[PDB]
Symmetry: D2
Subunit: 235 residues, 4 copies
């Protein structure tokens, strides 16, 4: 089994320097370009996705749409799950980062961001940046939908989908492509490579560059992961 992870490029809120989380934000004109290059890299490097897996957040869906259109594989099957979404930023969704830093000071700020298990305070259910009762999640248990998260909490809800659903295609000899987000992807990678809780903060997965994993019958790396553009990734 071969798996391919693709992290989306920058969003319209990344540009405005706002915390995103689950807020459905569009890809910036810049991020739309990294997607094309991700697709160009798939075709070029001869990595051919048999099935596609995305989150319910537009930016990642778009990235897949663009990338698969340069790769000549727009036709492949597509499943979307909330469990592949980004780490919900809680109360911090739609709040200036630079302003957050001032109001919270450098320690607390860094915790909420590069901390493994400390979630931002939860967001108010009535806030303009609350996706509580959002149409795209109406067939899911309302009680499982988070109002704030941490990388650890992201991994918890991601695994069940991976184990059941994604594993199915991998174990069926299908090359799976996941177009996800920063937290959810490092989450998948922490699990796969057995990275401990402390060391995960050090992992960075760049944007618009496919990460490829070749797994054994037990879904454990047969060899070390590799990007289709090592140069661009090490920079």
């Amino acid at each position: 089994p071969k798996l391919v992870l693709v992290r989306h490029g920058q969003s319209e809120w990344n540009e405005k320097n706002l915390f995103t989380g689950w807020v459905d934000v569009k890809l910036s004109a810049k991020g739309q370009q990294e997607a094309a290059r991700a697709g160009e890299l798939l075709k070029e490097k001869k990595v051919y996705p048999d099935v596609l897996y995305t989150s319910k957040l537009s930016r990642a869906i778009q990235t897949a749409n663009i990338a698969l259109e340069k790769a000549d594989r727009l036709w492949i099957p597509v499943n979307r799950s909330w469990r592949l979404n980004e780490r919900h930023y809680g109360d911090l969704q739609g709040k200036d980062k630079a302003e957050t830093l001032k109001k919270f000071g450098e320690e607390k700020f860094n915790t909420y961001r590069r901390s493994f298990d400390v979630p931002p305070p939860p967001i108010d259910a009535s806030s303009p940046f609350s996706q509580k009762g959002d149409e795209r999640y109406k067939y899911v248990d309302p009680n499982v939908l988070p109002e704030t998260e941490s990388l650890a909490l992201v991994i918890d809800r991601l695994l069940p989908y991976w184990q059941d659903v994604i594993a199915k295609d991998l174990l069926s000899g299908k090359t799976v492509m996941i177009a996800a987000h920063g937290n959810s992807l490092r989450g998948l990678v922490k699990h796969l490579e057995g990275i401990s809780d402390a060391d995960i903060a050090k992992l960075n997965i760049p944007t618009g560059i496919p990460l490829v994993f070749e797994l054994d019958e037990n879904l454990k790396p047969s060899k070390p992961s590799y990007y289709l553009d090592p140069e661009a990734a090490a920079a």
Copy 2:
């Protein structure tokens, strides 16, 4: 029940004067502008799709992705089927429309183009323009895939999908959207409105402008189909 039909905008072969059919040709820069106009019409005119259905051809898949991006509904479930594909053009796929009109003459040219029962000649299986063995059809009974088609044949392979798959969603209370091709879409309209075998040749579906059908429980129009741009429709 509610149904939205969207004919993909222009393609890369509209300027080449080549009969396309099943060849997986892409949208042009103009096709893409049209896709986004469809999406804007969906949002502007308040038509909110719950589920999406596309053919296995990139030009409609591209149109769907673009329109939905504009309508903020990029998240909805998406299913694809070859039974929504364009009318296969047999040996005519990849050939100059104007050169072909000089070889077969006007009458034969119109029959190959707008006849209900008469299909083009079977394409050679080794022709560089044959979709035989195409990976995107490798989990389909090989013996059913066409080598030429007519609107009659198209309608035949399209109905089973509409009958089981698409109707389940309409009878489940969903607003279904179909991003397809001109022939297959006219094929469906014929079925829905009971258009005669003689009268169907003259119907035309505007590219990039959504046709909405308000169906009853028997999947029959409860009122006449309306385009989201009625003035531009006709």
Copy 3:
């Protein structure tokens, strides 16, 4: 690819000499033994279905349950379609088979029964033996559901499902098992073996005996089909 066909044993109506059709009649007590017998036959000859398809008619669903029980493959995926159903017997549904011979006469009786393309008279909509409005067909285009059917009509409706859905498991290397009826199963064997409209009336598929086919990449037979009990099948 390996396909396995299992024709269900007699119903309670077959017992009372009545034309069944789409009427949801239950398997008779002999039919239950014929079912069990069928399962004990899949296990013995080493035919292991990875997936199962059935009709919406309880008599065939029931045949699979019992057969798969004795076979130890109760866990496999199960999909069911009206397209795999028996031929809708029209007005003849719920009528004594012997009173129909007297009422119509030989040629016409042998017509509505063994003809390839001439279907029985359509059954009245308010008749008790009418499947119109039936809950198990409520998510299917109302307009496609028959009110009478011929063998020709049956293959036309059955073929789409076999081409799209069933063909997917075969082509995926999975061993398929289909629990259907007389007409639907023969209509499919006709398709497979190229039997002409003329020579089809002549073919009979014995009940409770698994007919296995060894197909190739084009879904066309490699070697001649064979029952698991050649003697009882030829009896």
Copy 4:
């Protein structure tokens, strides 16, 4: 939203005094009569399941088939999942309950039987009573498949399936039926009503009697649950 839970009855191992768990043991002649009574109970008390969910252990599947046969809804769509499976007993699987009590003693025996979070010793992978590699689970991440469990662990792996899959049908207005096991069914009950980690051991779900739940938008009980045979459940 209406959910009906059904516990499967007597297995071939009730007379054997053996730890079952994930071994694929089948019903006994009585187990089958209890499944018929459940079916007759469904039909009689007018509760019509629109769709079915079951574990991957034969004893519950049989129950479901027999039950639906009597109820007349044999046709309904059926879904299966390892996440509805019984609690795994680990090394104890296939071992005599009495000989086990001699090896560990009362306290440690009750702990392995009635506690909420102290699971049994991990079953060796080369034990003939180990479900490792069984075909029914070949398309599941090998890593997540248990080598022993507790009710606490059952609830952790069961939940994801309920949340995404089962609740989908529930939130779609369908009447759902789960034919599972004692641990898995009680596991779901502890979650549905808010039963404490220590009060759950005091909950007993009767074999063969369908337990109905009338839920609300949040999948929390609107009114208290009710068996289709109140007197028999007590």
